[PDB]
Ligand binder design. Structure first.
Ligand SMILES: C[C@H](CCC(=O)NCCC[N+](C)(C)C[C@H](O)CS(=O)(=O)O)[C@H]1CC[C@H]2[C@@H]3[C@H](O)C[C@@H]4C[C@H](O)CC[C@]4(C)[C@H]3C[C@H](O)[C@]12C
Ligand SMILES: C[C@H](CCC(=O)NCCC[N+](C)(C)C[C@H](O)CS(=O)(=O)O)[C@H]1CC[C@H]2[C@@H]3[C@H](O)C[C@@H]4C[C@H](O)CC[C@]4(C)[C@H]3C[C@H](O)[C@]12C
Ligand SMILES: [Zn+2]
Lengths: 1341, 72, 52
């Protein structure tokens, strides 16, 4: 059940699993986040409404001067997108707010209002989001990478080991809020427990308990369990709770009933506790020595005196037992301490507690928060209440409360805003229990502690900071507040908020240039998480902790796609099915499980909600109904993974792909690659430059179509219909009768984007693929972009590789590319460089853009027209002129004998200095397009007038073609008027269309309908008169250029770089390479049938770097081209549709269980010929990533062709014509072309420009300056005895500004001497030391 | 050499040293002990027969392992 | 300079989008070119050790 578009070539699809969650729209992060940002949102939640409800209303100094909020608006831009890339504006959208300045009357708190002046005030231009989540800030398409930062809540950290040298670990616990004072708990190595408010001094941690209305009795009964001792007529009985005695010294005879069930000295093993439980002991009679070290909880005083016998939390010695014996107590309370489990911590910290009771504790808090402030009753009350208990001065965000209740094993995920007695006490219990053995510590990386921002929330915060810095000014201008003379816009300033928001979108560690050199690059750049930036941890502070992968990445961030090198792991790329949760933490799909069934309901899980479940594994064969095939299946429960019984799973992975990203899920046979290698593979697939004829992955992974379509490059049909008029520019879809709106149907039209620059200087082209008179279904591609083909992402080209050494040309990783790959121009990649030539305004005068140039005859000026700009199309080369420009330079200041010379030949020395924009030395191109911006203070020249006329012709053509469709829709609606009630069918197609307004009709509601539709027609008329007026006026106006520039002339060269020894190349699995000798055809190897193997890689790179996936891909490719050549023979020897059907059907079934059966008996006889003609280059093959095609499937798919099952053909060398012993592997591997081109990298500099502060080399153009002869190189030269080369390496070649010119004079005059002198850098050092008062001089002898 | 080759060497180093630590722990050589090195209880047959020459009863082992779980 | 800044804040919301020298040359009654030169001159110099 396929469409008519999908049948262009139906990708053979292995992969055994059924997909149950189709791939989400890959750009959900950017789009949905910026959608939450900018929208009138009738609820106080996120969006701009959040910021405005936060900072407004502004009340003055209580003076009945208020400025409140009403509602805002997003006026449409003045320049739309492509206009805004041409000209250079920020694709903004002017903001508007309805602020409402109210002024209450004095002698009135809320008495009668005296003025409510309601006026709408401008502020800022928020740069809107394109349809592809890519803003346009200054002409270039920029992208704001999602950030990943610590969620405000609670954290229990270790800081294990190194401190204190005893090895003993500390267990600190931090309560970070959204906004307010922190709170920390920590152990000392002496094991007492201490607190600290915001990172200030430590404190005896019981002081905060006491400050919260806790005296020692209830402290000890919160942080401890009770053991009562009894004095029942003889010597110190004890309560026996049976499980109190696991792992403890038996320092006494544990008898019972006068029977000995446990004996002294031993240890109470589980046997003993078992037997005491079975033998029912409850009150054991132990000696006094065992109470001698116990601790007494409650307070005891002589009941006859009221004098304090034992304070709370004192150790009972024998004397105190005696003393309270004579007071009439048979109950005694003792803390159940223990070295293992119920440790003494709060008790011994009370030992450390200097203070005694509540008021003293509040005093100490007041003296630790701020010194010098004398303590006080109410000062202490206010300070302590306002640390953690002030709704104004402290608020966990609701995210804060949610983490704080999920990390305590609480109940409600949402609740209060400030802390409480119970929140603090639960923190402390959790802390002590962490240290007691039960419980564990949340390591940093755990994605339950990495809330994900994105464009929306970050821009919201920047607008927030803007609002605070402006409400300062608002309250200030309200200080002087005249009641009714300042409207609600002189209080504000617009440029503040615009400054903040532009600073974010244009200067950030996030808002960065789109890696727009390959559709996979954009859609793997917009899906991106970053841990750097403002508010995240940067490298120095942190640090190795967050580089790591952590088992909560399984389906939430890709593990095998992260930028290797300087910052690994800080650029985690988001998974395939991942999402941002409601609160923010990354979440992912999982299929629900009933009693024992695998439901098809996908259910989302965040990070903190997972471990309490037990998730199955997607690689589980299930039994045609939703029951597993076994009773025990692999699963993963809490980090660990293991076998579980069938009746225990709760969640199955949505699909085998979800562990990866869109980066590494395109690598076919990813499953057989060492993870570093898939890392480098994805990170070299993000850089493939779009070739000239982008072919297709001959072996793909299923996700490639979704990446091509969901990225913006393909030209996706908005509505299904017939194709009326294709063309290299535009595609005209005639919408069908059912997908067609009721009024003014019309037809959809797509203006493609022909040749044009992207940021990385490549060609972002679009070519139609659906030809004239041809159906298209909704949601289908019309026009392939760069590196797409038929809507299947084709980054590089497939080609014939043969693994074999072949004379050292591929030594380390080098590659040997036969000239059949470069003759065809199949890696010939097109690069569209932009050269600008401004025309500035110096003190001497304005630069000219004349065609009149000195010291260059007609020679270099043959390509220039009458005005100094080159023609569109002249094939400039290295060193020619594109824009003739001359600057007036007075004071020629003639010299000696040069003056004699001018006398000798009378040649008038000109007043003008040539500065024309000449092509960079080396490129060789075609000037595809010249644009001339002009300050509107200059008379536009002749060529700019040509350009204005031409663009205006174009825009007139376009907008008139638009008006035609529109009026056709309105005539349609007119017929829809007549069709009901008195339509005259054939009396309306004969006569002219324009004379339908005067068509007869009875004066019912339908005559008034005709009148109304005539009104609509004339409105459209005047509308497009005035709209073409506005188009002509946008074109005709001057530009608004930088300060002091007359006119800029942009010239778009279009180089075509082919391929040449040095151009890096690479497969997908991470086999790099540097194509190293572009061999003839004859020389290459050739299999017994004749075909020369185009590339020749190296065998020594498959075992050493375990990326055997490239050998399996090579074999699947060889089988694929086997099928291809079989269809080619069946089609060239032209057979029929019948043989083709039987053979393609044999290819598409092919054995093992698959989810792809197509049944070509429904393809019409003429579709299968088209299907063949698209397969005649070779049958594509899918292979979902961790669910690929196992080897034996490949072997049978080879045997379906006629290749040898071994995969290894016997090759004959091309030069000697004699068989390679030991057959080689040959196949069709898909190889990219990385854009580390050679001619971008090559560089050489003999005498260029120079610096200005130190006479060193400095060039610009391609760092047109010498290589850095750094320090380690100087160590090298000193290691050799060579010292002359060093002396000239930093005296003659580099700095000594007489040494270098004398060296050049000597070199030209054929005397290789050198006259060093002394470096100008050291002379600067003498001056910089001497400006300080340090007289450094050089002795002279 | 490449940047993944060096990472392979480091991964070999890391897992080899970890595994060889944990094989250094387990004894596999008899020194028949017959009752604890701390508590004195008899070590049962099954435990002394799995791990030959193990000085400590089961409970003493769990207890020392738990005091060491907080890393000394 | 301070006149241009006051009138530029005021024009930035009076006209809505942002001002042009042709228009400051008629709000301010200056000769339409002193505005250009003033706007070229009135800016600070970049700290030459700025980090790129
Ligand atoms: C009257 C008709 C209404 C829709 C039926 C109008 C609306 C837009 C018109 C087409 C566009 O201009 C594009 C194209 C331009 C070519 O150069 C000339 C042919 C094309 C096919 C035009 C024919 C026709 O005139 C169209 C369909
Ligand atoms: C990783 C490193 C290669 C990198 C160059 C190799 C080369 C030498 C190796 C160690 C030594 O053999 C001593 C010792 C041998 C024991 O039997 C097992 C472990 C030990 C610590 C080995 C660890 C590791 O395997 C080493 C460091
Ligand atoms: Zn023991």
């Amino acid at each position: 059940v396929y469409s008519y578009t999908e049948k262009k070539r139906i990708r053979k699809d292995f992969g055994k699993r059924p997909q149950v969650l189709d791939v989400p729209y890959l750009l959900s992060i950017q789009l949905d986040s910026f959608q939450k940002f900018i929208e009138q949102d009738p609820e106080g939640q996120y969006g701009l409404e959040a910021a405005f409800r936060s900072v407004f209303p502004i009340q003055s100094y209580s003076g009945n001067s208020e400025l409140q909020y009403v509602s805002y608006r997003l006026g449409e831009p003045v320049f739309d997108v492509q206009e805004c890339q041409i000209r250079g504006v920020t694709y903004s959208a002017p903001l508007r707010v309805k602020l409402r300045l109210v002024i209450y009357e004095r002698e009135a708190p809320e008495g009668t209002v005296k003025d409510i002046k309601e006026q709408e005030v401008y502020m800022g231009e928020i740069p809107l989001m394109t349809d592809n989540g890519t803003f346009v800030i200054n002409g270039t398409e920029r992208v704001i990478v999602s950030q990943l930062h610590r969620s405000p809540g609670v954290f229990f950290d270790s800081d294990k080991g190194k401190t204190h040298s005893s090895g003993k670990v500390l267990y600190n616990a931090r309560i970070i809020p959204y906004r307010g004072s922190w709170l920390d708990f920590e152990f000392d190595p002496k094991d007492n427990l201490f607190v600290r408010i915001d990172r200030r001094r430590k404190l005896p941690a019981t002081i905060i308990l006491r400050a919260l209305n806790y005296t020692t009795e209830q402290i000890l009964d919160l942080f401890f369990e009770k053991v009562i001792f009894e004095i029942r007529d003889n010597k110190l009985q004890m309560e026996l709770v049976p499980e109190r005695l696991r792992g403890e010294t038996a320092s006494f005879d544990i008898e019972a009933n006068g029977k000995v069930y446990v004996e002294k000295g031993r240890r109470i093993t589980a046997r003993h506790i078992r037997q005491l439980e079975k033998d029912d002991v409850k009150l054991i009679e132990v000696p006094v020595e065992y109470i001698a070290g116990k601790v007494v909880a409650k307070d005891y005083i002589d009941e006859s005196t009221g004098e304090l016998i034992c304070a709370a939390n004192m150790e009972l010695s024998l004397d105190l037992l005696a003393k309270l014996s004579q007071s009439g107590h048979k109950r005694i309370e003792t803390l159940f301490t223990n070295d293992l489990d119920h440790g003494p911590y709060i008790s011994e910290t009370l030992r450390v507690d200097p203070t005694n009771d509540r008021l003293s504790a509040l005093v100490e808090i007041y003296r630790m928060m701020r010194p010098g402030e004398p303590p006080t009753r109410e000062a202490a009350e206010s300070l302590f209440e306002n640390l953690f208990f002030s709704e104004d001065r402290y608020d966990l965000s609701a995210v804060g409360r949610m983490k704080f209740n999920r990390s305590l094993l609480r109940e409600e995920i949402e609740g209060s805003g400030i802390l409480s007695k119970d929140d603090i006490i639960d923190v402390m219990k959790k802390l002590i229990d962490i240290r007691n053995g039960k419980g564990e510590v949340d390591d940093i990386d755990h994605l339950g502690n990495r809330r994900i921002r994105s464009v929306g929330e970050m821009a919201e915060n920047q607008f927030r900071v803007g609002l605070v810095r402006v409400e300062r000014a608002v309250k200030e201008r309200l200080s002087l507040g005249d009641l009714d003379t300042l409207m609600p816009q002189d209080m504000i300033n617009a440029k503040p908020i615009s400054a903040a928001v532009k600073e974010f979108f244009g200067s950030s560690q996030l808002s960065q240039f789109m890696d727009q050199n390959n559709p996979l690059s954009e859609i793997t750049h917009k899906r991106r998480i970053s841990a750097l930036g403002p508010g995240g941890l940067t490298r120095e502070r942190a640090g190795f902790e967050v580089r790591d992968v952590h088992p909560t990445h399984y389906g939430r961030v890709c593990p095998i796609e992260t930028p290797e090198g300087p910052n690994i792991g800080l650029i985690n790329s988001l998974s395939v099915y991942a999402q941002t949760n409601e609160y923010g933490f990354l979440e992912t799909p999982y299929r629900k499980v009933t009693d024992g069934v695998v439901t098809d309901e996908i259910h989302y899980l965040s990070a903190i909600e997972e471990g309490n479940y037990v998730i199955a594994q997607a690689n589980s064969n299930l039994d045609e109904e939703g029951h597993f095939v076994e009773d025990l299946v692999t699963c993963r429960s809490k980090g660990e993974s293991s076998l579980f019984s069938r009746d225990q799973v709760d969640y199955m992975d949505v699909s085998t792909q979800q562990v990866v990203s869109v980066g590494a899920s395109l690598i076919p046979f990813l499953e057989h690659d060492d993870a570093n290698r898939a890392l480098m593979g994805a990170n070299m697939q993000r850089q493939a430059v779009p070739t000239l004829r982008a072919d297709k992955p001959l072996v793909g992974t299923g996700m490639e179509r979704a990446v091509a379509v969901d990225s913006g490059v393909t030209a996706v049909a908005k509505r299904g219909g017939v194709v009326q008029y294709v063309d290299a520019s535009r595609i005209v879809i005639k919408v069908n009768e059912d997908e067609m709106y009721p009024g003014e149907a019309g037809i959809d039209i797509y203006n493609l984007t022909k040749y044009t620059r992207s940021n990385q200087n490549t060609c972002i082209n679009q070519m139609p693929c659906v030809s004239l008179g041809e159906p298209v279904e909704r949601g289908d591609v019309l026009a392939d972009g760069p590196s797409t083909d038929l809507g299947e992402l084709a980054l590089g080209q497939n080609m014939r590789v043969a693994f074999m050494p072949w004379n050292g040309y591929n030594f380390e990783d080098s590659i040997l590319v036969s000239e059949r790959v470069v003759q065809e121009d199949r890696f010939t990649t097109i690069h569209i460089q932009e050269l600008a030539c401004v025309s500035r305004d110096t003190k001497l005068g304005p630069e000219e853009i004349t065609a009149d140039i000195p010291n260059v005859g007609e020679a270099a000026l043959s390509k220039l027209d009458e005005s100094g700009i080159v023609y569109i199309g002249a094939e400039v080369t290295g060193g020619d002129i594109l824009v003739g420009k001359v600057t007036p330079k007075g004071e020629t200041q003639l010299t000696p004998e040069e003056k004699l010379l001018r006398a000798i030949f009378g040649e008038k020395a000109s007043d003008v200095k040539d500065s024309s924009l000449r092509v960079p030395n080396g490129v060789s191109g075609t000037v595809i397009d010249v644009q001339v911006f002009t300050r509107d203070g200059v008379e536009k020249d002749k060529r700019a007038l040509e350009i204005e006329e031409m663009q205006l012709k174009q825009a007139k053509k376009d907008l008139s073609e638009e008006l035609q469709i529109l009026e056709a829709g309105l005539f349609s609606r007119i017929r829809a008027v007549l069709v009901a009630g008195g339509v005259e069918a054939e009396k309306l197609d004969k006569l002219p269309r324009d004379r339908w307004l005067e068509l007869g009709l009875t004066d019912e509601e339908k005559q008034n309908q005709l009148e109304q539709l005539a009104e609509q027609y004339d409105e459209l008329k005047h509308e497009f008169e005035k709209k073409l007026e506005a188009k002509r006026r946008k074109i005709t106006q001057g530009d608004d250029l930088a300060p002091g520039v007359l006119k800029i002339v942009k010239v778009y060269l279009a180089v075509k770089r082919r391929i040449q020894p040095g151009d890096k190349m690479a497969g997908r699995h991470g086999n790099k390479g540097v194509i190293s000798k572009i061999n003839p055809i004859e020389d290459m190897p050739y299999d017994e049938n004749g075909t020369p193997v185009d590339i020749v890689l190296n065998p020594l790179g498959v075992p050493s770097r375990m990326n055997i996936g490239q050998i399996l891909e090579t074999h699947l490719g060889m089988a694929a081209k086997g099928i291809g050549d079989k269809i080619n023979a069946m089609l060239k020897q032209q057979q029929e549709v019948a043989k083709l059907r039987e053979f393609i059907q044999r290819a598409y079934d092919l054995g093992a269980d698959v989810r792809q059966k197509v049944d070509l008996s429904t393809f019409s006889d003429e579709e299968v010929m088209r299907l063949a003609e698209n397969l005649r280059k070779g049958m594509p093959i899918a292979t979902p990533v961790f669910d690929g095609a196992k080897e034996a499937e490949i072997k049978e798919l080879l045997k379906l062709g006629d290749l040898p099952t071994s995969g290894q053909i016997r090759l004959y060398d091309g030069r000697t014509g004699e068989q390679f012993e030991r057959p080689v592997t040959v196949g069709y591997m898909y190889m990219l072309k990385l854009n580390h081109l050679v001619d971008d990298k090559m560089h050489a500099r003999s005498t260029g420009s120079y610096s200005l502060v130190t006479q060193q080399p400095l060039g610009g153009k391609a760092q047109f300056g010498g290589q850095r002869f750094g320090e380690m190189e100087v160590w090298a030269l000193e290691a050799y005895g060579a010292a002359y080369t060093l002396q000239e390496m930093l005296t003659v070649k580099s700095d000594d500004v007489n040494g270098r010119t004398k060296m050049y004079k000597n070199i030209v005059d054929g005397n290789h001497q050198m006259e060093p002198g002394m470096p100008e850098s050291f002379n600067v050092l003498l001056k910089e030391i001497r400006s300080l008062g340090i007289n450094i001089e050089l002795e002279d002898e | 050499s490449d940047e993944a080759d060096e990472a392979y060497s480091v991964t070999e180093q890391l897992t080899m040293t970890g595994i060889n630590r944990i094989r250094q722990k387990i004894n596999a050589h008899g020194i028949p002990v017959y009752l604890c090195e701390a508590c004195g209880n008899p070590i049962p047959e099954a435990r002394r027969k799995i791990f030959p020459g193990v000085t400590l009863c089961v409970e003493c082992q769990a207890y020392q392992e738990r005091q060491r779980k907080h890393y000394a | 300079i301070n006149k241009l800044n006051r009138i530029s804040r005021q024009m930035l919301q009076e006209m809505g989008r942002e001002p042009t020298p042709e228009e400051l040359a008629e709000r301010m009654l200056m000769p339409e070119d002193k505005i250009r030169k003033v706007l070229k001159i009135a800016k600070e110099p970049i700290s030459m050790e700025t980090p790129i």
